[PDB]
Structure formats: C-alpha cells, structure tokens
C-alpha cells in the first residue's frame, strides 16, 4: 500500500463563470484572474456582471481551475499559518513554537508548498511538500548551516540539524533513527495541512462563487 503526497479534490464546480479581456502590458497578476495566451480570464470573486460559463469538458476549465483552487485555498488559511506566496504555487508558513535548544537565536518555520496536479481530464489534487526554513532570529533572514557554524559555532549547527530532523519526524524527538519514520512523516504532513486550512475532520468543503470545493485530507493510495 503506497501513499503519495497528493490530496484529492473530490468535489468541485462542474461549471465556472469566467470573463475574458485582452491581455495588456500593464497587467499585474493577482487573485481571481489568469493570463492565458493573449487573454486574461477573470473568475471567482473577479467576475463582474458580464460572464460566460465553462465546464470541465473544456480545456480552458483546467487551466483556470488549477489557479482558482489555490486562490480559494488562500482565503481559508487558519492561524497560525501565513501566506508566503500565491501564484502558480501556494506557499504557507508557520513558526515552530515548540521548545528546542538554541530557539532563542535560531527560528524554525514549517513551509507547506502546495501545487495543483491535474490528470485524466477531470481529476484534480493538491501536491503538498513540507520544508523547514531555518532563520537567524535576530534578523529573521534565512541562515545556512555553514553560517550557523561560523556565527554561533559547531555545536549549535549540529544541534539545529538534529532538531530540524526531529521536527520533520526524520528522527525521534531524542534524535535517533526509528523504524516507522515514513508513516509518521506522512501523518505530520497530513496533520499540518489540516491545521493550515482549519480542518478537524479528514475532509473539508470550501465555498466558492460557483459552488463547493471538497478536499479529502488523506493521501492518495496506490495499492
Ligand atoms: C470578496 As473576497 C472573499 O475575495 O475578499
Ligand atoms: Cl497570470
Ligand atoms: Na460539484
């Protein structure tokens, strides 16, 4: 039983309202709109009175829905997660607030990286990657292990790496290898994804102007 980091959208609007205008140079990309070739399509909360409807049998549907999906998710982020990047990709972050040695000088931050996967014409899912960013707490900037070693010394470097591995569940909280690591790492991913979208249940529905989007917070299974 193989589990993949893709969380399926099991319901979405089979029809969505879109507006098209010609692309123009001053266009600034943003929510509720997408450039497609030499048109910009408005959708979701960007729809003015003027509109056309497109269904999932149309190639345009997937090109729009892949972005609309992220736009909606971006409207449903729960504290303490924050939006870091929205566009073709959705990145959310939160600070690791549990204790670890050298937390006073080194800030750790989980980052969920959310992309949309589309396959067999009508299937959508979010592909979700988890990274931990390591920040120098005094200036809130990214800091490499080498720079930690130079600035705070070898001991801090080594300890941070163990803490990072423990927060990824690559090691036990005590810093040791364990047997059940890929199961627990998936549970962590699923649990953080649930938290980030305010979900206590293994599925959640999100409202859109076109109808509901339903996501199941359970990784796809290849048996
Ligand atoms: C109208 As809205 C949910 O895009 O702020
Ligand atoms: Cl765009
Ligand atoms: Na539907």
Å from CA of 115 to ligand 3 middle: 21
Please tell me the residue having the least CA distance from ligand 1 atom 4.
Answer: 45
Spatial separation of the C-alpha atoms in residues 26 and 39, rounded to whole Å? 13
CB 8 within 8 A of CB 220: yes
**CB-based burial, 171-194: b 16+ in 10 Å, e otherwise:** beeeeeeeeeeeeeebeebbebbb
Provide φ and ψ at 101, rounded to 5°.
-70, 140
Q: Identify any residues that bridge with 108 across adjacent strands, giving them in sequence order.
A: 134
Question: Strands 52-55, 82-86: parallel, antiparallel or unpaired by DSSP?
Answer: unpaired
Count CB neighbours of 215 within 10 A: 26
Token pair for residue 151? 């600035």
| Atom of ligand 1 at shortest range from CA of 45 | 4
* Ligand 1 atom at minimum distance from 32 CA: 4
Name the method of structure determination.
Answer: X-ray
List, chain by chain if needed, residues with CB within 6 Å of any ligand 1 atom. 45, 75
Q: Any idea which ligand is nearest the CA of 10? A: 3
In angstroms, rounded to a whole number, what is the distance separating the alpha carbons of residues 173 and 93?
22
Task: Give the angle subtended at the CA of 91 by the CAs of 18 and 129, to the nearest 5°.
Answer: 110
Mutate to test the pocket of ligand 1, among 67, 73, 75, 210 (most ligand atoms within 8 A of CB): 75
Residues 6+ apart with CB under 8 A from 27: 35, 40
Contact 107, 135 (CB under 8 A): yes
Cβ count within 10 A of residue 24: 8
Measured in residues, the chain has a length of 223
Only one residue has tokens 């893709």, namely 6
Nearest bound ligand to CA 28? 2
Tell me the ligand closest to 46's alpha carbon: 1
> For residues 190 and 213, what is the distance between their CA atoms, to the nearest angstrom?
18
212-217 CB contacts, 8 Å cutoff, 24+ apart: 212/11, 212/12, 212/13, 213/9, 213/11, 213/12, 213/13, 213/69, 213/72, 214/9, 214/10, 214/11, 214/12, 215/7, 215/8, 215/9, 215/10, 215/126, 216/7, 216/8, 216/10, 217/7, 217/190, 217/193
Q: Could you tell me which residues are beta bridge partners of residue 215?
A: 9, 204
On the question of a cis peptide bond just before residue 171, with omega within 30 degrees of 0, the verdict is no
State the Cα–Cα distance between residues 54 and 190, nearest whole angstrom: 32
Q: Give residues with Cβ within 8 angstroms of 102, minimum separation 6.
A: 152, 156, 159, 160, 163
Provide the token pair at 192: 């953080």
CB 147 within 8 A of CB 122: no
Is the distance from CB of 19 to CB of 48 less than 8 angstroms? yes
Who contacts 13 (Cβ-Cβ below 8 Å, separation ≥6)? 208, 210, 211, 212, 213
Distance between CA 223 and CA 203 in Å, rounded? 21
Kindly write down the DSSP assignment for every residue of the chain, as one continuous string.
-EE-SEEEEEE--SEEEEEEEE--TT----TTEEEETTEEEEEGGG--S--EEEETTSHHHHHHHHHHHHHHHHTT--TT-EEEEESSSEEEEEE--S--TTTTTEEEEEEEEEEEEEETTTEEEEEEEEEEEEEETTTTEE--HHHHHHHH-HHHHHHHHHHHHHHTTSS-TTS---TTHHHHHHHHHHHHHHHHTT-SSSEEEE--TT--EEEE-S--EE-
Cα 138 to chain centroid distance, Å, stands at 27
Q: What CA–CA distance (Å, rounded) separates 90 from 75?
A: 11
Give, for ligand 1, the residue of 32, 42, 45 to mutate: max count of ligand atoms closer than 8 Å to Cβ: 45
């Amino acid at each position: 039983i193989l589990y993949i980091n893709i969380y399926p959208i099991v319901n979405y609007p089979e029809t969505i309202k879109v507006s098209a205008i010609p692309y123009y140079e001053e266009f600034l990309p943003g929510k509720w709109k997408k450039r497609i070739g030499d048109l910009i399509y408005l959708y979701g909360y960007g729809i003015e009175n003027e509109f056309d409807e497109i269904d999932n049998s149309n190639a345009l549907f997937g090109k729009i829905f892949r972005k609309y999906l992220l736009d909606i998710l971006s409207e449903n982020i729960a504290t303490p997660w924050q939006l870091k990047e929205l566009g073709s990709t959705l990145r959310l972050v939160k600070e690791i607030t549990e204790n670890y040695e050298f937390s006073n000088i080194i800030k750790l931050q989980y980052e969920l990286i959310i992309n949309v996967h589309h396959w067999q014409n009508t299937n959508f899912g979010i592909i979700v990657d988890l990274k931990i960013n390591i920040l120098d707490r005094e200036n809130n900037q990214r800091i490499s292990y080498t720079k930690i070693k130079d600035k705070y010394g070898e001991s801090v470097k080594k300890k941070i790496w163990v803490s990072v591995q423990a927060f990824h569940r690559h090691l036990t909280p005590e810093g040791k290898k364990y047997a059940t690591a890929m199961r627990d790492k998936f549970n962590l991913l699923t649990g953080l994804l649930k938290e980030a979208f305010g979900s206590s249940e293994d599925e959640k529905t999100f409202s859109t102007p076109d109808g509901e989007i339903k996501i199941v917070f359970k990784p796809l299974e290849i048996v």
